């Protein structure tokens, strides 16, 4: 159930070319989703961005990997969707995978694994710890980055 | 060493739903490349376009899955690069994986395995027979398609 995540970050050269930079992180496949690998360009999502008006413009170019840092649970107490619901909505919107940074809402792990009986066909990964920090520092400062999620 | 390939065609709807069609097929990871999963937008290359230097190198956004249908060897007398060279060049040009349809040149399988001692860090996949046909009939109709290459 360990999720080996590779992030390919593109760093602007002074000539305005870009330089590939690869970083390694580790998370866990949630029992809520497939035990499969996935790869695609990272799109950061705010978690309250995964409540549905069901608009066409919400469908990102098929195959993106969504990165969602969960807020402290006493901040969005009337949440549109469960964390599990948010993962599904991400997949409906074209996500090949979702990574949850569960650092500020570690109870979210349990909330996901309760959906274990009807799992998503796509992987749902959670990160925390330094591994979440590394990913978020890439994502916050990274205009374009690509994630490769490898199972085993 | 079996590569499980899914080719997903996709279409945004005004209704706010992705419509998808997934075709499943089987190929093999060459020893020429990493034994790793990979996923990205499919780009069809004519095998001659994996030749000359640097004009077309950044044509395609990093992360694409190259589909190259080989020609019979005698058609291509003076080959700019070996089939192995062609695979390496695709990866220099951003490819996250390469799929060769080796139907018209099955000696390519042996050529690729010659580079087994110094494999690429990205997977190099081949298909033939009915698997190659399904793949090519989707790729030739020139819509946008994602390929998912699952190692086991």
Residue numbers in the entry:
A (entry chain A), B (entry chain B): 54 to 205
Question: What did the authors write?
Answer:
Rspo (R-spondin, also roof plate-specific spondin) proteins are evolutionarily conserved from fish to humans and have well-documented roles in a broad range of developmental and physiological processes resulting from enhancement of canonical and non-canonical Wnt signalling. Here we report a molecular level analysis of the ZNRF3/RNF43 ectodomain structure and its interactions with Rspo proteins.
By using a combination of heavy atom and molecular-replacement-based phasing strategies, we determined multiple crystal structures for Xenopus (x) Rspo2Fu1–Fu2 (highest resolution 2.2 Å), xZNRF3ecto, zebrafish (z) ZNRF3ecto and mouse (m) ZNRF3ecto, (highest resolutions 2.4, 1.6 and 2.0 Å, respectively), plus complexes comprising xZNRF3ecto–xRspo2Fu1–Fu2, mZNRF3ecto–mRspo2Fu1–Fu2, mZNRF3ecto–xRspo2Fu1–Fu2 and xRNF4F3ecto–xRspo2Fu1–Fu2 (at 2.1, 2.8, 2.4 and 2.7 Å, respectively). The crystal structures for apo xZNRF3ecto, zZNRF3ecto and mZNRF3ecto showed no major differences in the main chain conformation. All but two of these crystal structures reveal an extensive interface (average interface area 992±109 Å2) formed between two ZNRF3ecto polypeptide chains. The β1–β2 hairpin forms a second interface by reaching out to embrace helix αA and the β3–β4 loop in the opposing subunit.
